[PDB]
Amino acid sequence: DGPEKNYEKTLAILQIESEKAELRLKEQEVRRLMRARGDGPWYQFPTPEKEFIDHSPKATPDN
Amino acid sequence: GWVRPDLGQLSKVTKVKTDRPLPENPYHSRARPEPNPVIEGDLKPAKHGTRFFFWTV
Protein backbone atom coordinates (compact mmCIF):
# COMPACT_ATOMS: atom_id res chain seq x y z
CA ASP A 1 0.00 0.00 0.00
CA GLY A 2 2.90 2.43 0.40
CA PRO A 3 4.87 4.12 3.17
CA GLU A 4 2.16 6.58 4.26
CA LYS A 5 -0.04 3.74 5.55
CA ASN A 6 2.67 2.42 7.87
CA TYR A 7 3.68 5.96 8.86
CA GLU A 8 0.18 7.02 9.91
CA LYS A 9 -0.52 3.66 11.56
CA THR A 10 2.63 4.18 13.63
CA LEU A 11 1.40 7.67 14.52
CA ALA A 12 -1.95 6.27 15.70
CA ILE A 13 -0.22 3.54 17.74
CA LEU A 14 2.12 6.06 19.37
CA GLN A 15 -0.79 8.35 20.27
CA ILE A 16 -2.67 5.44 21.85
CA GLU A 17 0.36 4.28 23.85
CA SER A 18 1.27 7.78 25.05
CA GLU A 19 -2.32 8.37 26.20
CA LYS A 20 -2.28 5.03 28.01
CA ALA A 21 1.00 5.89 29.76
CA GLU A 22 -0.31 9.28 30.89
CA LEU A 23 -3.52 7.65 32.12
CA ARG A 24 -1.59 5.03 34.11
CA LEU A 25 0.57 7.69 35.79
CA LYS A 26 -2.52 9.76 36.59
CA GLU A 27 -4.23 6.66 38.02
CA GLN A 28 -1.25 6.04 40.30
CA GLU A 29 -1.39 9.63 41.53
CA VAL A 30 -5.17 9.43 42.06
CA ARG A 31 -4.89 6.20 44.04
CA ARG A 32 -2.08 7.63 46.18
CA LEU A 33 -4.03 10.82 46.95
CA MET A 34 -7.24 8.95 47.79
CA ARG A 35 -5.45 6.45 50.02
CA ALA A 36 -3.63 9.28 51.81
CA ARG A 37 -6.75 11.42 52.34
CA GLY A 38 -9.85 9.45 51.41
CA ASP A 39 -12.32 11.92 49.97
CA GLY A 40 -13.16 10.37 46.60
CA PRO A 41 -15.15 7.23 45.78
CA TRP A 42 -12.25 4.88 46.47
CA TYR A 43 -10.77 3.72 49.79
CA GLN A 44 -13.92 4.60 51.74
CA PHE A 45 -13.40 2.56 54.89
CA PRO A 46 -16.58 1.54 56.75
CA THR A 47 -18.37 3.23 59.66
CA PRO A 48 -21.06 1.97 62.08
CA GLU A 49 -24.55 2.32 60.67
CA LYS A 50 -26.48 5.42 61.70
CA GLU A 51 -29.95 3.93 61.23
CA PHE A 52 -29.57 1.43 64.11
CA ILE A 53 -29.54 4.06 66.88
CA ASP A 54 -32.46 4.50 69.26
CA HIS A 55 -33.93 7.99 69.27
CA SER A 56 -37.10 7.14 71.20
CA PRO A 57 -37.49 8.53 74.73
CA LYS A 58 -35.94 6.23 77.31
CA ALA A 59 -36.11 5.50 81.03
CA THR A 60 -33.28 7.83 81.98
CA PRO A 61 -33.84 11.41 80.74
CA ASP A 62 -30.09 12.18 80.64
CA ASN A 63 -29.37 10.63 77.25
CA GLY B 1 -64.45 15.65 94.72
CA TRP B 2 -61.39 13.52 93.95
CA VAL B 3 -61.85 10.38 91.86
CA ARG B 4 -59.27 7.61 91.88
CA PRO B 5 -57.89 6.92 88.37
CA ASP B 6 -58.94 3.67 86.75
CA LEU B 7 -56.65 0.89 85.57
CA GLY B 8 -54.53 2.10 82.66
CA GLN B 9 -55.11 5.84 83.00
CA LEU B 10 -51.95 7.05 84.75
CA SER B 11 -49.76 4.91 82.45
CA LYS B 12 -50.64 6.48 79.09
CA VAL B 13 -48.82 9.21 77.20
CA THR B 14 -50.39 12.65 77.65
CA LYS B 15 -49.85 15.83 75.67
CA VAL B 16 -48.89 18.93 77.63
CA LYS B 17 -48.92 22.64 76.80
CA THR B 18 -45.93 24.75 77.77
CA ASP B 19 -44.42 28.12 76.89
CA ARG B 20 -40.86 26.86 77.32
CA PRO B 21 -39.17 26.82 73.89
CA LEU B 22 -38.06 23.58 72.31
CA PRO B 23 -34.25 23.22 72.47
CA GLU B 24 -32.99 22.98 68.91
CA ASN B 25 -29.63 21.39 69.86
CA PRO B 26 -30.18 19.33 73.02
CA TYR B 27 -27.02 17.27 72.51
CA HIS B 28 -24.83 20.40 72.07
CA SER B 29 -23.69 18.86 68.80
CA ARG B 30 -20.97 20.40 66.67
CA ALA B 31 -21.40 20.98 62.95
CA ARG B 32 -21.54 17.70 61.06
CA PRO B 33 -18.70 17.25 58.55
CA GLU B 34 -19.77 17.53 54.94
CA PRO B 35 -19.95 14.35 52.84
CA ASN B 36 -17.66 13.58 49.94
CA PRO B 37 -18.33 15.44 46.67
CA VAL B 38 -20.11 12.64 44.81
CA ILE B 39 -19.17 12.55 41.13
CA GLU B 40 -21.97 12.72 38.57
CA GLY B 41 -21.91 12.22 34.83
CA ASP B 42 -22.53 9.72 32.08
CA LEU B 43 -20.71 6.39 32.26
CA LYS B 44 -18.41 6.51 29.25
CA PRO B 45 -16.46 3.37 28.30
CA ALA B 46 -12.91 2.80 29.47
CA LYS B 47 -10.33 4.68 27.42
CA HIS B 48 -8.27 2.33 25.21
CA GLY B 49 -9.67 -0.75 26.91
CA THR B 50 -8.48 -2.00 30.28
CA ARG B 51 -4.99 -0.46 29.78
CA PHE B 52 -3.49 -3.54 31.45
CA PHE B 53 0.06 -3.69 30.03
CA PHE B 54 -0.04 -4.92 26.43
CA TRP B 55 -3.73 -5.85 26.22
CA THR B 56 -5.36 -3.78 23.49
CA VAL B 57 -8.89 -4.11 24.87
Curated annotation (Swiss-Prot), chain A:
Domain of life, source organism: Eukaryota
Compartment(s): Mitochondrion inner membrane
Family: Belongs to the complex I NDUFB5 subunit family.
Biological role stated in the UniProt entry: Accessory subunit of the mitochondrial membrane respiratory chain NADH dehydrogenase (Complex I), that is believed not to be involved in catalysis. Complex I functions in the transfer of electrons from NADH to the respiratory chain. The immediate electron acceptor for the enzyme is believed to be ubiquinone.
Subunit annotation: Complex I is composed of 45 different subunits.
Protein name (database record): NADH dehydrogenase [ubiquinone] 1 beta subcomplex subunit 5, mitochondrial
Biological source species: Mus musculus (Mouse)
Portion of the full-length sequence here: 127 to 189 of 189
Curated annotation (Swiss-Prot), chain B:
Location in or out of the cell: Mitochondrion inner membrane; Mitochondrion intermembrane space; Mitochondrion
Superkingdom: Eukaryota
Known function: Accessory subunit of the mitochondrial membrane respiratory chain NADH dehydrogenase (Complex I), that is believed not to be involved in catalysis. Complex I functions in the transfer of electrons from NADH to the respiratory chain. The immediate electron acceptor for the enzyme is believed to be ubiquinone.
Domain remark text: Contains four C-X9-C motifs that are predicted to form a helix-coil-helix structure, permitting the formation of intramolecular disulfide bonds.
Quaternary structure (record): Complex I is composed of 45 different subunits.
Family: Belongs to the complex I NDUFA8 subunit family.
Identification of the protein by name: NADH dehydrogenase [ubiquinone] 1 alpha subcomplex subunit 8
Native organism: Mus musculus (Mouse)
Organism placement in taxonomy: Eukaryota, Metazoa, Chordata, Craniata, Vertebrata
Residues of the full protein shown: 116 to 172 of 172
